[PDB]
Symmetry: D3
Subunit: 64 residues, 6 copies
């Protein structure tokens, strides 16, 4: 299975350690809930600039 | 944040309950690791046909038909 | 430019005429805002099942109760 | 609803102002045509280098040098 | 590497054989130009209705 | 059609010339296999940081590239 996560960096995060936790956690979720093979799981994390992510018509930067 | 999950159905699954567990699981995960707001988390699950998902240069339909 | 739209169908929609209005709509916007050549604009629309869309930790299906 | 826009930056654009215009415009369109709840609309703008975008078999960058 | 292909079905196609040709062709190109590891390559093909794909302001369906 | 390629840069690559090959290569494949008109093919290449790509529960960076 493929998992794509797009998030807006906030207050000095995410760190490489938190990224690892996200990767391992979503991966284990597929195993425990769907009994999937862990080795074939691909996860990609995209960090979006605050000025390029909109929620409810406003940029997250504006909202911040 | 935004999370997109693409997977191949198998042995009758996934059910709506398992899908609900996946939605709840990934959300709680974002909260636990990044302390993000649960309310604004969007999750989309795409179910892909075994003949349209390729791993290593071969479709999953072929792989599943082995062992 | 490329534009991808993912939405959950609802109350019979969206119809083909509606999908056409979205295509023409986002296309003109690009010309107006960035003066892009309309000829090279590509738009893709994806429909997602209520049991497959989550918002706030619950499926859209459950939210619709 | 979720919207993802990918474009090649050109002649000093797009500006943060121009980006907001795109976010606002796209969101309004979704309300105008589908009567969707504006509060839950997510839009993401990706900016791509002229060398990483292809059209008709050539990079946007090469197309420009031809003119 | 991950490759996503999106196309509008036409004149009966694409068949599963053509899908396999795309899956392998894309994979081979990655190994050939960048010498990537073939086993870890993931490819996903999305088939899009002609009423959901637009070019130059019109849907592929109207294009006539 | 539309083709999106996501990869992790490795050992001084990919170069613009390589990206051109990838663009032309993917485009020719659509022409040959599906008989598409070249002019309408759009290809986008995304370069992903090794600490952001996960495989089998670990990151490409931890696996030491790919």
């Amino acid at each position: 299975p493929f998992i794509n996560i797009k998030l807006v960096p906030e207050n000095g995060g995410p760190t490489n350690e938190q990224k690892q936790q996200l990767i391992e956690g979503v991966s284990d979720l597929m195993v425990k809930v769907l009994n999937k093979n862990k080795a074939s799981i691909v996860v990609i994390i995209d960090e979006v600039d605050s000025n390029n992510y909109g929620l409810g018509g406003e940029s997250v930067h504006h909202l911040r």
